[PDB]
Design an enzyme around this catalytic site. Structure first.
Site, mmCIF file in Angstrom:
data_model
loop_
_atom_site.group_PDB
_atom_site.id
_atom_site.type_symbol
_atom_site.label_atom_id
_atom_site.label_comp_id
_atom_site.label_asym_id
_atom_site.label_seq_id
_atom_site.Cartn_x
_atom_site.Cartn_y
_atom_site.Cartn_z
ATOM 1 N N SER A 1 0.971 -1.133 0.136
ATOM 2 C CA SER A 1 -0.083 -0.097 0.050
ATOM 3 C C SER A 1 0.887 1.467 0.058
ATOM 4 O O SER A 1 0.335 2.218 -0.133
ATOM 5 C CB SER A 1 -0.887 0.436 1.189
ATOM 6 N N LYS B 1 0.493 4.349 -2.198
ATOM 7 C CA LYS B 1 -0.740 5.512 -2.355
ATOM 8 C C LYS B 1 -0.192 6.804 -1.788
ATOM 9 O O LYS B 1 -0.767 7.746 -2.075
ATOM 10 C CB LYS B 1 -1.733 4.949 -1.469
ATOM 11 N N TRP C 1 -11.094 -3.410 3.261
ATOM 12 C CA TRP C 1 -10.144 -2.193 3.803
ATOM 13 C C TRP C 1 -10.424 -0.875 3.071
ATOM 14 O O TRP C 1 -9.522 -0.194 2.383
ATOM 15 C CB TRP C 1 -8.802 -2.567 4.218
ATOM 16 N N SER D 1 -4.990 4.391 4.314
ATOM 17 C CA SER D 1 -4.802 3.242 3.589
ATOM 18 C C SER D 1 -6.008 2.751 2.703
ATOM 19 O O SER D 1 -6.004 1.688 2.223
ATOM 20 C CB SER D 1 -3.960 2.139 4.066
ATOM 21 N N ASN E 1 -8.714 1.558 0.126
ATOM 22 C CA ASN E 1 -8.406 0.597 -0.999
ATOM 23 C C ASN E 1 -9.119 1.228 -2.041
ATOM 24 O O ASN E 1 -8.851 1.743 -3.124
ATOM 25 C CB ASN E 1 -8.293 -0.639 -0.882
ATOM 26 N N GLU F 1 -4.372 -6.969 -6.402
ATOM 27 C CA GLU F 1 -3.466 -7.985 -7.154
ATOM 28 C C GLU F 1 -1.739 -7.550 -6.966
ATOM 29 O O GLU F 1 -1.167 -8.303 -6.877
ATOM 30 C CB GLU F 1 -3.513 -7.896 -8.740
ATOM 31 N N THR G 1 2.690 3.835 5.157
ATOM 32 C CA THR G 1 2.760 2.302 5.421
ATOM 33 C C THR G 1 2.451 1.402 4.452
ATOM 34 O O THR G 1 1.542 1.853 3.468
ATOM 35 C CB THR G 1 1.855 1.956 6.604
ATOM 36 N N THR H 1 1.650 -3.045 3.809
ATOM 37 C CA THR H 1 1.550 -4.239 4.299
ATOM 38 C C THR H 1 0.976 -5.405 3.375
ATOM 39 O O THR H 1 -0.231 -5.248 3.277
ATOM 40 C CB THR H 1 0.745 -4.454 5.742
#
Ligand SMILES: *C(=O)[C@@H]([C@@H]1N=C(C(=O)O)[C@H](S[C@@H]2CN[C@H](C(=O)N(C)C)C2)[C@@H]1C)[C@@H](C)O
Length: 267
Positions: free
Chosen positions: A44, A47, A79, A104, A106, A142, A209, A211
């Site tokens: 992520s 972004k 998320w 974050s 999505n 993906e 961040t 993950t």
């Protein structure tokens, strides 16, 4: 780096994977580097650069940030904590950018990636600021596959830091957009256990961040403003060999501490 190269190797051996660090003292130009030119999945963390690309476009399109964007239920992927609350109303481009950076989000990231022309459009923006390493190739989710040896959707810790410095402290963005990018990063809510955990409470910090959820792959990049000296820009990326290896926030925080120690930043 020689001041901390042995502690970095011990840290990654205990973690059971690979740790990549680049840190730049923008005052003296001194650096700390560990696996700094290896590729690691962005997850992520792309972004943050996406929001910067939006801000760059907003320099030429004065009505961009206030533009309402409406979206359907099918846009809401796992998320999407902010955009799910505005499904029935829409959100502005600026609101989507803040959500992508600070939560974050999505769905917000996917909507903004569409606006910019997809993974290639964000890659083009990174090229335009002189980053020849960054590549985004796929969409959320993906792009988070984090497959060992796969260069798609990766960058290096060094290029991440170099680009972050250009965008937050250099001239890649005009001054108002630069401060907006900094403000979004400062307001991030997802990084309290990563670089921020290595940074004293009386210093300003902004971060983003990532993950991926597999292959021990997680990351954080940040600008840190220690009081009384020039800011520090740094990036900490991890990966590990096995799909079900878990990432570690503590390892990211520990690597950031070692980077600051190597730079001689009392913390
Ligand atoms: C990005 O990497 C993912 C999304 N972005 C974040 C983030 O905070 O950067 C979370 S990942 C974070 C770490 N532990 C939790 C987790 O991994 N979950 C919820 C599965 C939350 C979010 C998922 C992107 C790949 O979705």
């Amino acid at each position: 780096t020689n001041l901390v190269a042995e502690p970095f190797a011990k840290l990654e051996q205990d973690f059971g994977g690979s740790i990549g660090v680049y840190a730049m003292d923008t005052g003296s130009g001194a650096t700390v580097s560990y696996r700094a030119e290896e590729r690691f999945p962005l997850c992520s963390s792309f972004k943050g650069f996406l929001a910067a690309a939006v801000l760059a476009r907003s320099q030429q399109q004065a009505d961009l940030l206030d533009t309402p964007i409406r979206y359907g239920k099918n846009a809401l992927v796992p998320w999407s904590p902010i955009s799910e609350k505005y499904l029935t109303t829409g959100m502005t481009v600026a609101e989507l950018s803040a959500a992508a950076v600070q939560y974050s989000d999505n769905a917000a990231a996917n909507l903004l990636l569409k606006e910019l022309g997809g993974p290639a459009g964000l890659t083009a923006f990174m090229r335009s600021i002189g980053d020849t390493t960054f590549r985004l190739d796929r969409w959320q989710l993906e792009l988070n596959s984090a497959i060992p040896g796969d260069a798609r959707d990766t960058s290096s810790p060094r290029a991440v830091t170099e680009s972050l410095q250009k965008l937050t402290l250099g001239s890649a963005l005009a001054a108002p957009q630069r401060q907006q990018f900094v403000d979004w990063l400062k307001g991030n809510t997802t990084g309290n256990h990563r670089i921020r955990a290595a940074v004293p409470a009386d210093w300003a910090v902004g971060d983003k961040t990532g993950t991926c959820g597999v292959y021990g792959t997680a990351n954080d990049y940040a600008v840190v403003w220690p009081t009384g000296r020039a800011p520090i820009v740094l990036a900490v990326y991890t990966r590990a060999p096995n799909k079900d290896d878990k990432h570690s926030e503590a390892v990211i925080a520990a690597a950031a501490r070692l980077a600051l120690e190597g730079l001689g930043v009392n913390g």
